[PDB]
Amino acid sequence: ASSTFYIPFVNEMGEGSLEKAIKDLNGSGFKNALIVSDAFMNKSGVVKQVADLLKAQGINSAVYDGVMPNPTVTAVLEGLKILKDNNSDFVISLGGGSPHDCAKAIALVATNGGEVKDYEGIDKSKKPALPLMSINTTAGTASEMTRFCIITDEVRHVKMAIVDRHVTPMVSVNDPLLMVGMPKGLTAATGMDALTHAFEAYSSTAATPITDACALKAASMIAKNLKTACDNGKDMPAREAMAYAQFLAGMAFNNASLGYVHAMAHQLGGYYNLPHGVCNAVLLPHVLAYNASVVAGRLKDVGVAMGLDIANLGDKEGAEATIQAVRDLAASIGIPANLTELGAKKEDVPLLADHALKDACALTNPRQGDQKEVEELFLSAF
Amino acid sequence: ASSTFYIPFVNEMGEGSLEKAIKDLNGSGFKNALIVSDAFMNKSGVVKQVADLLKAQGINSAVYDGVMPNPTVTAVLEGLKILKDNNSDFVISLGGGSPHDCAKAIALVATNGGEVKDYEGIDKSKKPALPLMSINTTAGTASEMTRFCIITDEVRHVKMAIVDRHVTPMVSVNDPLLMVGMPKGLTAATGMDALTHAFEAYSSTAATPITDACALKAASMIAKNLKTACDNGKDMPAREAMAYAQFLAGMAFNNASLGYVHAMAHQLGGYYNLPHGVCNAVLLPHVLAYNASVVAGRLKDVGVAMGLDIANLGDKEGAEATIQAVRDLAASIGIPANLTELGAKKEDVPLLADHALKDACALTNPRQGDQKEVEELFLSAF
Ligand SMILES: [Fe+2]
Numbered sequence A, B: 001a002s003s004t005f006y007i008p009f010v011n012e013m014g015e016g017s018l019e020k021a022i023k024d025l026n027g028s029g030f031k032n033a034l035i036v037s038d039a040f041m042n043k044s045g046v047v048k049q050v051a052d053l054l055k056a057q058g059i060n061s062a063v064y065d066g067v068m069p070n071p072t073v074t075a076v077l078e079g080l081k082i083l084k085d086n087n088s089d090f091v092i093s094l095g096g097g098s099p100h101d102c103a104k105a106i107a108l109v110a111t112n113g114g115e116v117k118d119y120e121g122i123d124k125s126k127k128p129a130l131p132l133m134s135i136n137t138t139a140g141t142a143s144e145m146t147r148f149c150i151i152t153d154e155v156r157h158v159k160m161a162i163v164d165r166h167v168t169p170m171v172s173v174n175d176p177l178l179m180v181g182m183p184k185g186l187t188a189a190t191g192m193d194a195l196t197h198a199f200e201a202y203s204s205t206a207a208t209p210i211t212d213a214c215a216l217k218a219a220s221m222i223a224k225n226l227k228t229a230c231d232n233g234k235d236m237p238a239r240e241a242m243a244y245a246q247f248l249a250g251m252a253f254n255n256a257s258l259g260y261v262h263a264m265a266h267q268l269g270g271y272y273n274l275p276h277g278v279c280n281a282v283l284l285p286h287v288l289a290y291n292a293s294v295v296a297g298r299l300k301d302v303g304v305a306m307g308l309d310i311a312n313l314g315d316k317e318g319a320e321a322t323i324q325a326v327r328d329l330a331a332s333i334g335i336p337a338n339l340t341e342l343g344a345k346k347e348d349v350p351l352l353a354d355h356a357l358k359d360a361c362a363l364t365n366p367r368q369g370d371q372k373e374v375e376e377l378f379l380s381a382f
């Protein structure tokens, strides 16, 4: 089957990539940047940092730090208000996945005029988004390079997936210098989110030789660095490795798509308002076991990439040994042991599974189940 | 580690990607396309095929089939005039490397300045190029996705290099259906060129975890499919694999750069007027032996990727086995035995070695040598 590989045409990486990306704006014509970010990014001073570097280049900026996890239409609308009142001609997301998603929606609407909901689906926008630069500060999401934009309707209580090549940032930035500050908990969660992207992309029915290569490289680098990055966030080599790893994982899932881990995790997070990262982290092992009955061999490929001594094992054993390795890694970095700790409730599963099967990510899972299998899958995670 | 990954926003691949790509143009606003290609692409009907698919989407087109192997400035001027008389609002390159570079220049000068020279260098253009779609028909160049643009101006007899993020095509197309027609010699030469890209990019001092991942995957796929595509150009799986492989090789060298193989090959190709791919092919094994003194370990990684049973060998021994594997491959697909057969004269070595060291690709070769060492390298290649 034919395929399509989406990605920003310019992707800056490594220590110093931030200064470089900002200096390249010289002669771009941009004068007013709308910086979309987290309250935590503005408090630590990262927002000022970017604002100042922009200044030195003669570029002004307005800040909207009202972005919280699970970006909503309200947040998008607020950012659009600031953009309007400042006539921002450029958008810069700063932070983790939430900021990137919110920025993409703001940028798309700014040029397409209408409502977020109108663009839910595949390539619904008629025109390119307002130019957008995405500066990533967590090592697991890759939203700074995907053509995905997921915004939550707070009123209806619904998550809308915008799959549009127009939301692909014009420039992505992955400077590990901005990731050093990630506390151990965040490092572990976003790291597992990235590992999840690798696993799901490699297991996807839309996998291609390119996504395969990226996903495996991501898994390998994660197995080699995540634990290190968690034990000591000052280890620059580890931070940089995780930055390339999460990007490679995005190169894979942005194009092969995901599976049941995210189909489900999107529900737990968007219902209990839990962190995207940790939800996938706790669900991963259980979904892999569920899929092992269909992609045992490929799961073994990932384990080998991860350095596991399973090359001489049959696929079943190799797969089970891989899953066990994921469980061990998760424990070693303190991921919560189950959905019970996450604060999930068995009474909500019937609805969680119901929405899970309707999530855009479910279509590519290797093993397709019914409203009753997904419910039982969920229950097995508590 | 302070790197930049360049690549088109959209890359269509696989059987039928050409039609999918043109179809996505419906409602794009483009009305007049400029199709840049060779004389043999226009005669064989491939141009018409594209022009008709464009008509179905309400897009008219004009054609410029004057592109000669090794793009020239006169060519860029010729295509530029055609664009003027038809008031073209976007460009489409059709063919191998030559058509792509010509189109890139045409599209860049069409919205920026008037002379090609004005853009020689890095990021010289101040404005984006006129929208460009590059449809690749050979399996080894990757010009449809690089930010490189090389144009030879007969006057000074100099090949100007335009390294600009703006010459990166807006959309790349790799449909193996348009590659089935590649005769044996061409698939072998372009195939070996892609292998060289993987080897040089993996050996490059500018390599990153991303380019490494793409390079190894490219070498792996080529090792498993090149011979088959040469023995049976009708085998779609083989052609499909080579399309993906040559793209991956591009994802790698466009970002990590190359080495002494191309530095040297570019001299033979110019100071003898020989095909790019074949010069690289014959040279490759020799340069690898030379670089082995510094990157033995990495050469072994490529050999393992290529499916060689050398995992239990030392790096020095693995590299030699990999180098021998390259020699065996080249021979099995009809690549000349040495420079003597290419029509090169030993008395030209001093001159060839001097310009090789002056080549831009020389800077990233893992082993740096002087005039003497290079002259010797060349001679040992006879
Ligand atoms: Fe995720």
Ligand SMILES: [Fe+2]
Residues within 6 Å of the ligand: B141, B193, B194, B196, B197, B262, B276, B280
């Ligand atoms: Fe080449």
